[model samples]
Target: AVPSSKEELIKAINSNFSLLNKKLESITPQLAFEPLLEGHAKGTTISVANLVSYLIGWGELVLHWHDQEAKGKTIIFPEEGFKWNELGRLAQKFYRDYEDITEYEVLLARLKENKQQLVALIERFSNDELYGKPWYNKWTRGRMIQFNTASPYKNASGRLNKLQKCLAE
Candidate 1:
């Protein structure tokens, strides 16, 4: 009943993979930056240095979670399979690199690339074919819907919100 068989597990994983893809696609740089800017707007004083750091840290989390979910050994869905420890490790590694970088511009460029990769992966699936069909009926459809509707506009909103807020404040 719990989908213990390998066939069932694979099916579960496949469905979950579809959902995971949806979630990843839903997370745009804007989605990532909203809270960051919110913090800054609240006088948190986050620097470009800190913003780049946060971007890469967030990207790494999404990347590793995507990797783990694609592994296929785990029977669980995306949320359950999400490896926060891996994300934490990536954040620590990013912190170490942040200390070495002398120029904020260079760090921003690198983070831009990282964010682009994540965004590209999402963009590749924005069309209806990828987002429309459910792999199976038993699984939840929320992820797919979220990715389809909310993800594409996030990067622009995030950047504008951050810049406007930063400049106004």
Candidate 2:
């Protein structure tokens, strides 16, 4: 069910994040850079680090969108160089965003920080502000936040879980 209230939205974000985090804990260094998970591109695959980085990209972008909207900056949907349909390209860009990092734990920590920040930002909005009307092309503020946060958390965890089953020792 879609969250229509601020409280529901926050709860969804927290629970999904916890689930995702638990799945992440089981990932070892040996599996960190393996292309074990399905990729954004069909018939391709991505590493655990890439998957986590992708989540971090969306989370940070959610925060960035809200901050920019507050400052009256024109919001760029998805990102500047990419359109919604070009998400595969954007995902690759996300992979590159954290490519310099060597430690998988650092990527995990960054993702946690981004999720925490998004949750804090959500707390500022009232239920009406979140779901009273459209904030971004029929998406309420709450919907947009969920699209980037809880929804992705759920999706990522599912992907990781499937890979874990296949790789089970």
Candidate 3:
């Protein structure tokens, strides 16, 4: 949602959390251990814990890139020596990092605070910086506010929706 406010951004973040819960609400201890989630680090071989870890961990990417540029430092489009087209590989590396965590509660405490932090970061900018294509790119070659709201934020919501549906099948 473009032309959005910090409130709207906050709402979107809350909704993202809502969907995260909706998808995993049915997960019993047994189901969580059943290997239901598909394809992050490996193919069709994930669990709720890993997915939750993956989901929460992704926001870090947007935050890292944004903060780097906000500090008058260099911003890589995806990462050093990586391009946007390699996003799948990026995700594999991401979710792979959390493979050891097997509990959703592990990261639950920070979710709300992290969302607020990103929204506050958004609040630091005017609508033009948030919406206008070039306002953010001035400091570096990439990482507009859209990077947070558009992909990292939207993808979490969307991926959960897809995961929920697929798990139901």
Report the number of the highest-TM-score candidate: 2
Which stretch of 10 consecutive residues in model 2 shows the poorest summed lDDT? 29-38
| TM value for model 3 | 0.68
lDDT of each: 0.44, 0.89, 0.58
Backbone collision count in every prediction? 0, 0, 1
Q: Over the stretch 1-169, how does candidate 2's per-residue lDDT look in tens digits?
A: 6888999999999999999999998988777897777898878789999999899998888888878988999999988888999988988988999888778888788989888889889888889999999999988989989988999899999998888888776
Show pairs that collide, candidate 1.
none
Task: Evaluate residue 149 in candidate 2 and report its C-alpha lDDT on the 0 to 100 scale.
Answer: 90
Tens-digit lDDT string for candidate 3 (120-143): 777776655554445443631123
lDDT of 2 at 68: 91
Per-prediction TM-score, please? 0.41, 0.95, 0.68
Better structure of 1 and 2 per lDDT: 2
Clash pairs, candidate 3, are 39-44
Residue-level lDDT for 104 in candidate 3: 50
